[PDB]
Amino acid sequence: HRNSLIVLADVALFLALYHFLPFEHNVVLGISMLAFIAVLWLTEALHVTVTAILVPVMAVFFGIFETQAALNNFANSIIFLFLGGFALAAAMHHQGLDKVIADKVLAMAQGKMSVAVFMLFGVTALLSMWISNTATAAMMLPLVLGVLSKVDADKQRSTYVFVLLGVAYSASIGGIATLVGSPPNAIAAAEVGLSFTDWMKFGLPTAMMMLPMAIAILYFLLKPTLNGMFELDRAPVNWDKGKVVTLGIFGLTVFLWIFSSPINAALGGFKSFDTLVALGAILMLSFARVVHWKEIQKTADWGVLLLFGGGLCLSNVLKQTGTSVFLANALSDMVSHMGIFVVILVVATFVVFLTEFASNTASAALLIPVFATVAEAFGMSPVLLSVLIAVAASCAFMLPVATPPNAIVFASGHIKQSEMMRVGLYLNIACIGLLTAIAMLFWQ
Amino acid sequence: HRNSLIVLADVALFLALYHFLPFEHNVVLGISMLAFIAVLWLTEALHVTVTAILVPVMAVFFGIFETQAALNNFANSIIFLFLGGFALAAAMHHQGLDKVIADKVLAMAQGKMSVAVFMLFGVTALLSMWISNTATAAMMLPLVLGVLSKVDADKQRSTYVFVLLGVAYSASIGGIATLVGSPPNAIAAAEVGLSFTDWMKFGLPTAMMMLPMAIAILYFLLKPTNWDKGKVVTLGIFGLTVFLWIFSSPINAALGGFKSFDTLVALGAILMLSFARVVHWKEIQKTADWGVLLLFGGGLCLSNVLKQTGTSVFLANALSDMVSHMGIFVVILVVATFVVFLTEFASNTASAALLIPVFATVAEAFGMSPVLLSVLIAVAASCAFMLPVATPPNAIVFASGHIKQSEMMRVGLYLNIACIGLLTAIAMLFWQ
Numbered sequence A: 001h002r003n004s005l006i007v008l009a010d011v012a013l014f015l016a017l018y019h020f021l022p023f024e025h026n027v028v029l030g031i032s033m034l035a036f037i038a039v040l041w042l043t044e045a046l047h048v049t050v051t052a053i054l055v056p057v058m059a060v061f062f063g064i065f066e067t068q069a070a071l072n073n074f075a076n077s078i079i080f081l082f083l084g085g086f087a088l089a090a091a092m093h094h095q096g097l098d099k100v101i102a103d104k105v106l107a108m109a110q111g112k113m114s115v116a117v118f119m120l121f122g123v124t125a126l127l128s129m130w131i132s133n134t135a136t137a138a139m140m141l142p143l144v145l146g147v148l149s150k151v152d153a154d155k156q157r158s159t160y161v162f163v164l165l166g167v168a169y170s171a172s173i174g175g176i177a178t179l180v181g182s183p184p185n186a187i188a189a190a191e192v193g194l195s196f197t198d199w200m201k202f203g204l205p206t207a208m209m210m211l212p213m214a215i216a217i218l219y220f221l222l223k224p225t226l227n228g229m230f231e232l233d234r235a236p237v238n239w240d241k242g243k244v245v246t247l248g249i250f251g252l253t254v255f256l257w258i259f260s261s262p263i264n265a266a267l268g269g270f271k272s273f274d275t276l277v278a279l280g281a282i283l284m285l286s287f288a289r290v291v292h293w294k295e296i297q298k299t300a301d302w303g304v305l306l307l308f309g310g311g312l313c314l315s316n317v318l319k320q321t322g323t324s325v326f327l328a329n330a331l332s333d334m335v336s337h338m339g340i341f342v343v344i345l346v347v348a349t350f351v352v353f354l355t356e357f358a359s360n361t362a363s364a365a366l367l368i369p370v371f372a373t374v375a376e377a378f379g380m381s382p383v384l385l386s387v388l389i390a391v392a393a394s395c396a397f398m399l400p401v402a403t404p405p406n407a408i409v410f411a412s413g414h415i416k417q418s419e420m421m422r423v424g425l426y427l428n429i430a431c432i433g434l435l436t437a438i439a440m441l442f443w444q
Numbered sequence B: 001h002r003n004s005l006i007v008l009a010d011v012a013l014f015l016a017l018y019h020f021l022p023f024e025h026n027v028v029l030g031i032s033m034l035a036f037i038a039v040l041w042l043t044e045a046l047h048v049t050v051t052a053i054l055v056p057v058m059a060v061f062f063g064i065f066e067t068q069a070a071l072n073n074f075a076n077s078i079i080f081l082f083l084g085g086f087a088l089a090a091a092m093h094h095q096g097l098d099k100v101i102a103d104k105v106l107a108m109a110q111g112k113m114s115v116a117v118f119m120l121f122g123v124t125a126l127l128s129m130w131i132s133n134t135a136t137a138a139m140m141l142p143l144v145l146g147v148l149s150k151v152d153a154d155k156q157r158s159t160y161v162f163v164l165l166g167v168a169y170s171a172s173i174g175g176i177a178t179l180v181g182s183p184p185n186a187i188a189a190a191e192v193g194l195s196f197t198d199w200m201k202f203g204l205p206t207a208m209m210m211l212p213m214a215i216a217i218l219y220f221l222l223k224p225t226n227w228d229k230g231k232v233v234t235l236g237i238f239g240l241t242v243f244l245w246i247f248s249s250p251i252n253a254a255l256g257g258f259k260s261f262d263t264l265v266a267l268g269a270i271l272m273l274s275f276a277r278v279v280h281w282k283e284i285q286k287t288a289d290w291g292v293l294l295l296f297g298g299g300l301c302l303s304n305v306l307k308q309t310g311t312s313v314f315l316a317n318a319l320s321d322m323v324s325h326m327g328i329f330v331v332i333l334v335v336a337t338f339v340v341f342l343t344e345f346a347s348n349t350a351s352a353a354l355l356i357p358v359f360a361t362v363a364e365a366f367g368m369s370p371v372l373l374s375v376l377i378a379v380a381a382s383c384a385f386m387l388p389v390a391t392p393p394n395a396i397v398f399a400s401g402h403i404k405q406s407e408m409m410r411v412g413l414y415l416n417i418a419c420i421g422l423l424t425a426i427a428m429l430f431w432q
């Protein structure tokens, strides 16, 4: 098979780099490993999580760490803060609080495709802030195909592709608003030690800008939906048992997540307060009987939770072997010749296009450690590159295979490959600007 | 709701013990917490895992530990050693290697009900060694009901309940052979730091003995009776994993002495199984019981809450005279007896999650090897044989809408007493 070969080709690459690199053994090991993992995660010949589990089992056998010390990465507070976000999402889906949020808002538009689709995007993004990205897409597709049936003429495609590609992007832009939403955010927060409200100060404003900037680009390429009528055909929804409760807990949780800084300070200064709140939410939702555990076990992506640990293990493997400082020495002249504009532009550009070929999180899982630790060897705060890398990681807008949401609206069997491949090629450039713009603004 | 009250009553209980107990404040906290958690886990007002997650958020807020230090319990090497067993199960089930293991064995009996039912038990136990207990029962139930169709006499119950209660017990007794099999076993290994081959030297002989003793009691009551793509690979990988797990002691030592070698072997299996393409991760993620994996961490955090607060030494001091008045026989007989019946009323693992920390840490304050009480407790925890709701395998063969509550309650009442003897018997021999 292909992937069995990519692994074999990668295994050879490691053995080659291992015996032939002419540096201090620690650097040779860290270099060989970083290459090995980079392939397995970008090619994905092996499952992201399988590669994640491979990270510790390597460091342990090659004397970098001891077994228990390596595994301890998989229990970082962010993992549980993310697992708390999973149970918080699983709750309002099994409860239907996502459905009622779509109807009550989508019915606010009386019957206009103009104010409908503009409401479909705002809801898809708002829902990605807390639930997910791949999950929010599948939940929206039937609601879009339902609306896009009055103008059911396929020969009227562009009226019916603008709404499909629009939500698939709003789900990705929504995941850039909060620490929960896309693993990349958690990978950055866990790498540089970000709080929920810390990452929101970065991503949310960026998403505020990217959503209009993204619709404008979608609008002014082939919008033909001004006229149209609504066919809300199905049983309406209605606030049932504790859908207000889930909203209350949710709102309460997000209130503590936002006001965690003063709440925690005016409480004794606990360590991972946001992680506790995420764990506290898991409790309230269970005491309030609103969600069973079987639900969370399905919704939770334990592979990403395992990936989180694998990514932190890598970050620590780069340091212990000095590969973080060795690469900073290697880039000394190169990076001194470059400006930080070129850097954040090269990085942003590199990822915003790199994420088109590989998984969103699999890209951050590899670059967030390298750039953060190398930025550290340079004595630079790994926050900027990490948040930057983590944000541009969720900027997959060209071909599918970049993000599941892309392949979700593509399986609708209507939007042409070429159609998507070129809207993202424009949006990618748009973000490289906005990001480098915002990345420059978020400086002083 | 019923359970919603237990929680409220338990919060009050904590406030009461907290405000009214007159001991060093730490003992009040550790005692209050131990009671709080003890209720939540035996009553199950909250899901086992919800209570487990409640442990760290408690210790963290009540200054016992720091958030990250508390959470670090959920990454113990035993947890990952068990996750390897899950991928090892998901592999050979998604491969179908468990069914073919039942067919190849079940057809070896030419056409005899006498040798038929006796073969259904041996496979349920063999499959519980590696797969699970609730899963081994549900996986066996269709295969068990299938045999009981030639002689389908309805009011021929005892001919048709001995085979149902036999597997429901063989699934629970089978899980006492290896560190993978039943969560209680893993809880002991994580508490006292046992290796895979260490726990097998203890449990496997006991499982060798308990299975016949269990069928004999059922017998002598009213008994009137293609190897495809890489199924050899799954079998190969599996065998390789178990070979390293057994010979891990010399293999690891003759390699540089890695720390949690069994955990490495367990994680290596997850890798071999994935490189060999024989099982996808979505399979491993489904078969894996992440709730139990989270529970493992919660139980270790409690154990550390008992020590950090001194409740282990306070209870060791409180039980000082009582245990000195008792022989070690009297102690392990009270203990063994205490659980073998407690496991009838509460979950198998929920019993070990609470008793293994308390007894192990107190036994340690006595300067005693906490292995015996811990391994003992973990074994007697899987001795639920009376009423249903003791173990899913019990409630699995019970949902057949045929086996009477009283019928099971008195065959198990015989097995329970039978086990209290066997356990205390072996527990006494395993001393010097």
Ligand SMILES: O=C(O)/C=C/C(=O)O
Pocket: B132, B133, B134, B135, B181, B182, B183, B347, B348, B349, B350, B382, B390, B391, B392
């Ligand atoms: O291992 C199981 O399936 C169940 C264990 C228990 O409930 O004790």
Ligand code: NA
Pocket: A127, A128, A129, A130, A131, A132, A133, A171, A174, A175, A176, A180, A181, A182
């Ligand atoms: Na999201």
Ligand code: NA
Pocket: A354, A355, A356, A357, A358, A359, A360, A361, A363, A393, A396, A401, A402, A403
């Ligand atoms: Na991607």
Ligand code: NA
Pocket: B127, B128, B129, B130, B131, B132, B133, B136, B171, B174, B175, B176, B180, B181, B182
């Ligand atoms: Na088992």
Ligand code: NA
Pocket: B343, B344, B345, B346, B347, B348, B349, B381, B384, B389, B390, B391
């Ligand atoms: Na039980």
